């Protein structure tokens, strides 16, 4: 992703990918933790997960 949003690294993408694939849903604290670990905001995780769904639906 080199449009608008910052290009996520492999490590970042892999973690978010595995977490979402493993646990389609997360808790507030867990999301905050994941975000904290990624040195980002909860929004980064919240939107990434949703972006994946929207990508599946729209850009099927």
């Amino acid at each position: 992703t080199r449009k608008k949003r910052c290009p996520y690294t492999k490590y970042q993408t892999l973690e978010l990918e595995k977490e979402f694939l493993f646990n389609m849903y997360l808790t507030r604290d867990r999301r905050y933790e994941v975000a904290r670990v990624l040195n980002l905001t909860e929004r980064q995780v919240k939107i990434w997960f949703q972006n994946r769904r929207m990508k599946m639906k729209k850009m099927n």
């Binding site: 608008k4 949003r5 980002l40 939107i47 990434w48 972006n51 990508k55 850009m59 099927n60």
Partner: peptide, 20 residues
């Protein structure tokens, strides 16, 4: 070295605009 960017610059939600 700046705090401009945007609250949605780091987290954009329009990467998937192609509905089709």
């Amino acid at each position: 070295n700046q705090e401009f960017d945007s609250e949605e610059e780091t987290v954009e939600d329009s990467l998937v605009e192609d509905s089709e």
